[PDB]
Paper text:
Y314 resides close to the carbamate moiety and it was previously found that a spontaneous TCA1 resistant mutant harbors a Y314C mutation. We measured the inhibitory activities of TCA1 and its analogs against DprE1 and the Y314C variant and observed 5‐ to 40‐fold shift on IC50 values under the same assay condition, which is consistent with the MIC shift between the wildtype (WT) and the mutant strain. We also generated a Y314A mutant and it is sensitive to TCA1 inhibition, suggesting that the side chain of Y314 does not directly contribute to TCA1 binding. To elucidate the molecular basis of the resistance mechanism, the structure of DprE1 Y314C bound with TCA1 was determined to 2.2 Å. Although the overall fold of the mutant enzyme is identical to wildtype, consequential structural changes in the active site of DprE1 were evident. The most striking difference between the WT and mutant DprE1 complexes is the 180° flipped orientation of the boomerang‐shaped ligand in the active site. The alternative orientation of the ligand can be linked to the effects of cysteine 314 substitution on the orientation of Lys134, which positions the ϵ‐ammonium group in the void created by substituting the tyrosyl ring with a thiol. The reorientation of Lys134 is driven by formation of a strong H‐bond (2.75 Å) between its ϵ‐ammonium and the thiol of Cys314 and results in a noticeable shape change of the active site around Lys134. Consequently, the acylcarbamate keto‐oxygen in the original orientation would clash with the alkyl moiety of Lys134 (with the shortest distance at 2.7 Å), which likely weakens the binding of TCA1.
Mtb Decaprenylphosphoryl‐β‐d‐ribofuranose 2‐oxidase (DprE1) is a flavin adenine dinucleotide (FAD)‐dependent enzyme, which together with decaprenylphosphoryl‐d‐2‐ketoerythropentose reductase (DprE2), converts decaprenylphosphoryl‐beta‐d‐ribose (DPR) to decaprenylphosphoryl‐beta‐d‐arabinofuranose (DPA), an essential cell wall component. Multiple covalent and non‐covalent4 DprE1 inhibitors have been identified and showed in vitro and in vivo activities against Mtb, further validating DprE1 as an attractive anti‐tuberculosis (TB) drug target. When analyzing toxicity profiles, we noticed that many TCA1 analogs show inhibition of CYP2C9, one of six major cytochrome P450 enzymes which determine the clearance of 75 % of marketed drugs. Here we report the X‐ray crystal structures of WT DprE1, a TCA1‐resistant DprE1 mutant, and CYP2C9 in complex with TCA1 analogs.
Numbering used by the authors: 6 to 268, 273 to 461
The structure:
C-alpha cells in the first residue's frame, strides 16, 4: 500500500487536480480507507479510478482521495457452461478477452480501446459496435459487489431487492461507491474472427438511408467513419463496416486449426505520408469506393475493431493533447435535426478528421446510461479560439433535439445542460442520497455537474 499526492487528468490531459492516490492490491485496505473517509468528518471524499481512459474529470477528486483500482486484477473464474466470468473490478478488457477466448467466450461489449477496467466499463455503461444488437456493458452484468458509504459490501443484481442501486451504479460514474467485483455473462463464440461487409456512401443522405433501409438487423456489429469536413454533397459520406462473429466453417482452412487464437505499422513502411497526385480527384474517389466495398471478408479483432492501429504515431497528431473529444446521440426520429447538427459542424470553422458514426438500438433501465435509440456521433476538434463557445452552442442544439452528451467524453458541459439532457437525474440523485448521505463519494465531475 502507498498513498501519494498526484496530479491527475483524464485522457484528454486537461482540467488537472491534486488528490491523495491510494494504490493497493489489498481489498481490506480499500474498505478501511472508505471507512476512514466516512468516520472522520464529511471531507472532500473519495472516488474510484480505473485505467484513466475517460476524457473527462469523473476519475479525479481535487483535495480528496482517489483509489486506483488497477492492482485489484484477479480473474477468479471463467466457466464455459454458464458463460460467466467472475472478476475483480480492476481487470481490464484486454486481459479478460485473452483469458476468455480459450473457453469460446467473447467480451459482450468492446469499446474502441481495450485498456479499460471492468469497473470503468460498468460505471460509464460503455457501448460499442454491437449496441443495436446487444445494448451496453451494464446489460451483461449478472452481479456486482459494491463497497458503499457505510463501509459495507452489498451484493447487487439487476433484478430483485437492490435492483435500484444496481441500475444507479451502471453509468453512475463511481458515485454510488467502489465496484470491487463483478460477474459478467459473456457471448459464446467458436472463433476470434469477424465476417464483414463494407460499403462506402457518397453523402450524408446516403449514410442515413443505408442505416434506415432495414439492413442493420442482418449485422450484429456496425459502425462508420464519417466525413465532417467536406462541404455538401460530400459532407456525411461514410466508410461503413458491418459484420458478425465468424463460425469455424466460414474460416479459410489455414485459420481453422487455431480458430480462437488472438494473432510494423503504416508510418514505418508506406510513409511519410499516404497521398499521391490521384488522392483528391476522381481516381482517388474510385479507389476509395472500391477498397471500402466488399462482402464476406474475414477479419481479425485488430482489423475489424481497432482499424486505427494500422496508423501509428499518426494517431498522435489527431489527439489527445490539443484536442477536444465530443460525443452525442440524437433520437432516431429526429433525423432532420441530426442532419442539421452535422451542417452546423462543417460550417463552424472547426475541422474534425476522425468521426465515428453508429446507430444505437434500445436503451436499458439505468437512469444515467448515455445510449438511447438514435444517431450517435463522436468528433474530435483541435483546441482553437472559439471552440469552447461553439461546443456550448452544440450542447444547446443537442439538448433541444432530445439528445445528450457522453460523460466519458466530457469535461466542459454545465450542470444545467446535463440535468435537462438526463431527465431521470433527480430519480438517480435521490438513489445516491439514500446510499451516500455524507457525500463520501465525490469527484470533480460530481461537483461540476451537481450530482453530489
Ligand atoms: C481511445 C479511446 C476509445 C474509446 N472508445 C469508447 C467506445 O467505443 N465506447 C465507449 O463507451 N467508451 C469509449 N471510451 C471511453 C472509455 O471506455 C470509458 O471512459 C471507460 O469508462 C474508461 O474506463 P477506465 O477503467 O479507464 O475508467 P476511468 O476513466 O479511470 O474511470 C471512469 C469512471 O469509472 C469509474 N470507475 C472506475 N473504476 C471503478 C470502480 N472500481 N468502481 C466504481 N467506479 C469506477 C470512475 O470513478 C470514473 O467515474 C474510449 C476512450 C478512449 C481513450
Ligand atoms: C469503430 C472502432 O473505432 C475505433 O477504432 N476507435 C478509435 O480509435 C478512437 C480513438 C479515440 S476515440 C475512439 N473511438 C470511439 O470513441 C468510439 N465510439 C464508438 C461508438 C459506437 C461504435 C464504435 C465506437 S468507436
Amino acid at each position: 500500500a502507498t498513498t501519494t499526492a498526484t496530479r491527475l487528468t483524464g485522457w484528454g490531459r486537461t482540467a488537472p487536480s491534486v488528490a491523495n492516490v491510494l494504490r493497493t492490491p489489498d481489498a481490506e485496505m480499500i474498505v478501511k480507507a472508505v471507512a476512514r473517509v466516512a468516520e472522520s468528518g464529511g471531507g472532500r471524499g473519495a472516488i474510484a479510478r480505473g485505467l484513466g481512459r475517460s476524457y473527462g474529470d469523473n476519475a479525479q477528486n481535487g483535495g480528496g482521495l482517489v483509489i486506483d483500482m488497477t492492482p485489484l486484477n484477479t480473474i477468479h473464474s471463467i466457466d464455459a457452461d454458464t458463460k460467466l466470468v467472475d472478476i475483480d473490478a480492476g481487470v481490464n478488457l484486454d486481459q479478460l478477452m485473452k483469458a476468455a477466448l480459450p473457453f469460446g467466450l467473447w467480451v459482450p461489449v468492446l469499446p474502441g480501446t481495450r485498456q479499460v477496467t471492468v469497473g470503468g466499463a460498468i460505471a460509464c455503461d460503455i457501448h460499442g459496435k454491437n449496441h443495436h444488437s446487444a445494448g451496453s456493458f451494464g446489460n451483461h452484468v449478472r452481479s456486482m459487489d459494491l463497497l458503499t458509504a457505510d463501509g459495507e459490501i452489498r451484493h447487487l443484481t439487476p433484478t430483485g431487492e437492490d435492483a435500484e442501486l444496481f441500475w444507479a451504479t451502471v453509468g453512475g460514474n463511481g458515485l454510488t461507491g467502489i465496484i470491487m467485483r463483478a460477474t459478467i455473462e459473456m457471448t459464446p463464440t467458436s472463433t476470434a474472427y469477424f465476417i464483414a461487409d463494407g460499403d462506402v456512401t457518397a453523402s450524408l443522405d446516403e449514410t442515413i438511408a443505408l442505416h434506415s433501409d432495414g439492413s442493420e438487423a442482418r449485422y450484429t456489429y456496425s459502425s462508420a467513419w464519417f466525413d465532417a469536413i467536406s462541404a455538401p454533397p460530400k459532407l456525411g459520406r461514410a466508410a461503413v463496416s458491418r459484420g458478425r462473429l465468424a463460425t469455424v466453417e466460414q474460416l479459410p482452412a489455414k485459420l481453422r486449426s487455431e480458430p480462437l487464437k488472438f494473432d510494423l505499422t503504416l508510418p514505418d513502411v508506406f510513409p511519410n505520408g499516404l497521398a499521391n497526385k490521384y488522392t483528391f480527384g476522381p481516381i482517388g474517389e474510385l479507389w476509395y469506393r472500391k477498397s471500402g466495398t466488399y462482402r464476406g471478408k474475414v477479419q481479425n479483432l485488430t482489423q475489424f475493431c481497432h482499424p486505427l492501429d494500422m496508423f501509428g504515431e499518426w494517431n498522435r497528431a489527431y489527439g489527445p493533447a490539443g484536442f477536444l473529444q465530443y460525443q452525442f446521440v440524437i433520437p432516431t426520429e429526429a433525423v432532420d435535426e441530426f442532419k442539421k447538427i452535422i451542417g452546423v459542424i462543417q460550417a463552424s470553422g472547426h475541422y474534425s478528421f476522425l468521426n465515428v458514426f453508429k446507430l444505437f438500438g434500445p436503451r436499458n433501465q439505468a437512469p444515467l446510461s448515455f445510449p438511447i435509440p438514435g444517431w450517435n456521433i463522436c468528433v474530435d476538434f483541435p483546441i482553437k479560439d472559439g471552440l469552447g463557445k461553439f461546443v456550448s452552442e452544440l450542447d444547446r442544439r443537442v439538448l433541444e433535439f432530445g439528445g445528450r452528451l457522453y460523460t466519458a467524453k466530457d469535461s466542459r458541459t454545465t450542470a444545467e445542460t446535463f440535468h435537462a439532457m438526463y431527465p431521470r437525474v433527480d430519480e438517480w440523485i435521490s438513489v445516491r442520497r439514500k446510499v451516500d448521505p455524507l457525500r463520501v463519494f465525490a469527484s470533480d465531475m460530481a461537483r461540476r455537474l451537481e450530482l453530489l
